[PDB]
RNA sequence: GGAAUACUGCCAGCUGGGACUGAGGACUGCGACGUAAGUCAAGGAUGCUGGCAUAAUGGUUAUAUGCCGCCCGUCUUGAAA
RNA sequence: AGAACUGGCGAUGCGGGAUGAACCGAACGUAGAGUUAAGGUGCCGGAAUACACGCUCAAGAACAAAAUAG
RNA sequence: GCUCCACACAGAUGGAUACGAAUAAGGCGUCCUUGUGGCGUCGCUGAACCAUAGCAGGCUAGCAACGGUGCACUUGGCGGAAAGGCCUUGGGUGCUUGCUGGCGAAUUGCAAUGCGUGGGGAUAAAUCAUUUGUAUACGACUUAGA
């Protein structure tokens, strides 16, 4: 499952960006911006918030080698 | 994958029964064997009463099925080791189905049933049988609690049988339901 | 698995003698190399010709006309045993000529508890028309809208632990 | 009145559809047109593309379906009585193979629909559970 | 949710031996659903864990782990052989193991 | 009549997954890319990231675990003894 | 009894053979990866309760031997 | 064991999900021909059923039902093979993801799985002393006196 990310400006993001050198600011308003656009194509087909939301884990039985993830 | 296997031992032949049990409970899997009595061993009477008696004139000697059983499962551990020794608390057999096993579902291993191993038209000994005649005394109360056992399981079985009824009521007239058509489109 | 080769030899032609006979014979074997071992020694046993003494001319596989019809094959078989030898015949119901082959040597090995070393094949002849097998077995599977059940069936179970108790049912 | 209960094995026969459990053509419906032995018997099922060959009833599960067929009949034939039984609509409405194709959705469910499946069984259930007990 | 686990589980058969020889260095590691080579084949390179309580204290925890990696497979019924950086104390023979997705190839 | 497929062999064909190995120590040579500048998988691991001084790790010994190991030297003898 | 012609061992580890000097493979610096021999793959023991054809109810895995297909 | 003082610490982390019997027959639904009955349906594995969404699973505003369920109460029966477990009438208090939304996750920075003593207060009982002899090489065994 794939969602329509090019409407994300992910330019500003670069590797110099997560140097670690009371979370900074311009953290918070980069993470706000991007959670904007993301969430008008996440809501755009059914059930992906809820999917997104809930934690994946294994269960009795499962198959990782048959799984078709 | 199951912390507890119970496994019927109805039906199974000695030989086949007891090296799966080694193997499975030497790599830690705890089982429990029931209904030992009703074990058979291929071959008619005799040669089965026979083959007995032959290492018996020899120590101690168990004449209860389970204690065959036990002993057939004990040759194929390396006993007087400690993995051996620690293999063999994993174990259990009980004549019957005494509780709280009762209450709970026995599995059967089909690469040792008699059925599947045995060739139509031949003799097969049964281990209830031997250990009557090798001197065991506790046949005729093990039959006994063992016929009261399918007493009132019946019953249950019966009542269990009457929720489904219903249970597969409620669910077909819920069927056919956009969500019902939905889950079914998904293989569900 | 096996196979048919054809393989022909003229014993080295010489002088005061050419164009030999060209003994030619059809030899079963699973590769080139057996099949012209088994020609030598066949030549050695029945001819008065040595493999120092001959020469395999062409060596080429044959495969069965019709891989899919069913036909049943008459087979002149001559083998050694312990004691002598004895000819022998046996009639075998095959859709081709290798597989018929096959389960006369298993058969051999099994009824017989002999190999290929002393199994000679002399003749491999297909019967089409009914009353000219003899075999009763042959016979069996030759009866019109024939129909048989399997009983018993033994299913196999990948998993250890079975809740289902199985059936044999068919 | 006499009474004798169904005891009906499924006799190999020509015509007789069977499904291939091992070999290439695993998963594939053929059909038997031929006996050679108690072992071997000869199958087609053009209609799946297996090919003509013979195999051993050990290698096959015999199914309830059958139609008629000429003994020996060619591939073309075999495929013509095929098509005239309807043999594959009748392999459809058998519980065996739709339990089959449910099995291959199962192994084919992504992850995304592995979660709507969840949250359809919750909504199925949570009007089953009110169906009962009143 | 209920369940938290994101590896498969195993049982540790027995090192890698002849009949009197053994060579405790590889370990043999039976992951649960795999029975043939080909489904083996999917958890070559995944790390593998052997988790147990310790009696005395540690850097913050109470377990101890340690950490393996898998090598190749083993036998026809999916035994898969497995090394670790330290080696299991041969007391762990039939105990749980688990095997991790990463790293993962999908 | 024609497709194929079945089988043997070739690819100085393509494309992944898994395990060990990092040996040498400024350039001398055989080669490829490119009109050239220059680059390269071309006579041996390069770069980044993660944990650390009440460290990280390593070490000594008691038991325990899976397997193995007839008590030492001498002489008899062709051998074990 | 008497010899004798070439060979296995003399001083020889290692793997398999329940153990063995007359067997099979193979002869030796310290370790890793990989591939094998004999020998095996129901447990002890690492590995297919593999596949296919028939045989045998009793063991079966040189001496008491002579009396289901063609 | 009742009480005070003084000290102390072989491998859960989804559910072992329960008739019996045969394997050359079995279950499931229906009905009458109540029987070894007729029909349809299912196996060819557990690849199945439960539940499985929420910070290692929070706060919180609404909608749809009168359900599902955690915990402590209460009613009745049941389980003697190793019962010690099974339900279950009634109400109490929480969740409910059945449905519609809001609040926070960050910096751990790219993974390092993430439970009784040793000293006292009372005392139920044992052994020794005595005796007993139905016991006796020495242990042991057999009696009784607040």
């Given at each position: 499952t794939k969602v329509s990310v090019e409407g994300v400006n992910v330019e500003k993001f670069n590797v110099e960006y997560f140097a670690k050198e009371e979370i900074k600011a311009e953290r918070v308003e980069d993470q706000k911006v991007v959670d904007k656009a993301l969430i008008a194509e996440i809501k755009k087909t059914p059930l992906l918030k809820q999917y997104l939301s809930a934690s994946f884990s294994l269960k009795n039985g499962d198959k990782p080698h048959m799984l078709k993830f | 994958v199951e912390p507890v296997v119970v496994i019927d031992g109805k039906g199974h032949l000695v030989g086949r029964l007891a090296s799966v049990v080694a193997k499975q409970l030497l790599n830690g899997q705890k089982i429990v064997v029931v209904r030992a009595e009703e074990l058979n061993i291929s071959g008619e009477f005799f040669r089965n009463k026979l083959k007995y008696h032959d290492f018996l004139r020899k120590p101690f000697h168990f004449r209860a099925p389970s204690r065959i059983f036990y002993k057939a499962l004990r040759g194929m551990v390396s006993h007087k080791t400690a993995r051996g020794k620690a293999a063999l608390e994993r174990l259990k057999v009980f004549e019957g189905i005494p509780p709280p096993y009762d209450k709970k579902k026995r599995v059967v291993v089909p690469q040792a049933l008699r059925v599947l191993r045995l060739k139509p038209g031949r003799k097969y000994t049964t281990l209830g049988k031997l250990s009557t005649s090798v001197g065991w005394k506790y046949e005729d109360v093990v039959a006994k609690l063992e016929a009261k056992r399918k007493v009132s399981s019946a019953e249950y079985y019966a009542k269990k049988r009457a929720f489904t009824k219903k249970v597969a009521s409620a669910n077909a007239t819920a069927a056919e339901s956009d969500v019902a058509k939905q889950l079914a489109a998904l293989g569900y | 698995?096996?196979?048919?080769?054809?393989?022909?030899?003229?014993?080295?032609?010489?002088?005061?003698?050419?164009?030999?006979?060209?003994?030619?014979?059809?030899?079963?074997?699973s590769n080139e190399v057996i099949a012209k071992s088994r020609y030598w020694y066949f030549l050695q046993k029945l001819h008065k010709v040595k493999k120092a003494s001959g020469e395999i001319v062409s060596i080429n596989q044959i495969n069965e006309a019709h891989p899919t019809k069913?036909?049943?094959?008459?087979?002149?078989?001559?083998?050694?045993?312990?004691?002598?030898?004895?000819?022998?015949?046996?009639?075998?119901?095959?859709?081709?000529?290798?597989?018929?082959?096959?389960?006369?040597?298993?058969?051999?090995?099994?009824?017989?508890?002999?190999?290929?070393?002393?199994?000679?094949?002399?003749?491999?002849?297909?019967?089409?028309?009914?009353?000219?097998?003899?075999?009763?077995?042959?016979?069996?599977?030759?009866?019109?809208?024939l129909k048989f059940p399997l009983p018993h069936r033994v299913q196999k179970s990948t998993k250890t632990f079975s809740y289902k108790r199985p059936s044999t049912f068919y | 009145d006499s009474i004798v209960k169904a005891s009906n094995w499924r006799l190999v026969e020509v015509g007789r559809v069977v499904l291939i459990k091992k070999g290439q053509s695993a998963g594939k419906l053929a059909a038997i047109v031929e006996i050679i032995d108690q072992k071997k018997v000869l199958i087609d099922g053009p209609k799946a593309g297996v090919p003509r060959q013979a195999i051993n009833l050990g290698q096959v599960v015999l199914t309830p379906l059958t139609f008629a067929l000429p003994r020996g009949?060619?591939?073309?034939?075999?495929?013509?009585?095929?098509?005239?039984?309807?043999?594959?609509?009748?392999?459809?409405?058998?519980?065996?193979?739709?339990?089959?194709?449910?099995?291959?959705?199962?192994?084919?469910?992504?992850?995304?629909?592995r979660f709507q499946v969840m949250v359809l069984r919750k909504q199925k259930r949570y009007t089953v559970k009110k169906a009962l007990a009143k | 949710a209920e369940s938290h686990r994101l590896y498969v589980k195993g049982k540790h058969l027995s090192y890698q031996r002849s009949k009197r020889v053994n060579n405790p260095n590889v370990s043999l590691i039976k992951i649960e659903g795999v029975a043939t080579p080909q489904d083996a084949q999917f958890y070559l390179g995944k790390r593998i864990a052997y988790v147990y309580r310790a009696s005395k204290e540690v850097r913050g925890?109470?377990?101890?782990?340690?950490?393996?990696?898998?090598?190749?497979?083993?036998?026809?019924?999916?035994?898969?052989?497995?090394?670790?950086?330290?080696?299991?104390?041969?007391?762990?023979?039939?105990?749980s193991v688990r095997i991790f997705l990463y790293p993962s190839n999908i």
């Open positions: - | - | 698995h096996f196979k048919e080769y054809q393989v022909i030899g003229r014993r080295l032609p010489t002088e005061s003698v050419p164009e030999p006979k060209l003994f030619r014979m059809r030899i079963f074997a069913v036909k049943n094959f008459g087979v002149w078989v001559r083998y050694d045993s312990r004691s002598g030898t004895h000819n022998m015949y046996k009639e075998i119901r095959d859709v081709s000529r290798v597989a018929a082959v096959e389960t006369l040597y298993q058969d051999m090995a099994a009824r017989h508890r002999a190999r290929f070393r002393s199994i000679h094949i002399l003749k491999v002849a297909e019967i089409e028309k009914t009353a000219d097998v003899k075999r009763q077995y042959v016979k069996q599977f030759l009866t019109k809208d | 009949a060619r591939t073309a034939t075999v495929s013509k009585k095929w098509a005239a039984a309807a043999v594959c609509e009748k392999w459809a409405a058998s519980s065996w193979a739709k339990k089959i194709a449910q099995r291959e959705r199962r192994a084919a469910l992504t992850d995304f629909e | 925890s109470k377990i101890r782990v340690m950490w393996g990696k898998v090598t190749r497979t083993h036998g026809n019924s999916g035994v898969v052989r497995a090394t670790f950086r330290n080696n299991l104390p041969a007391k762990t023979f039939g105990a």
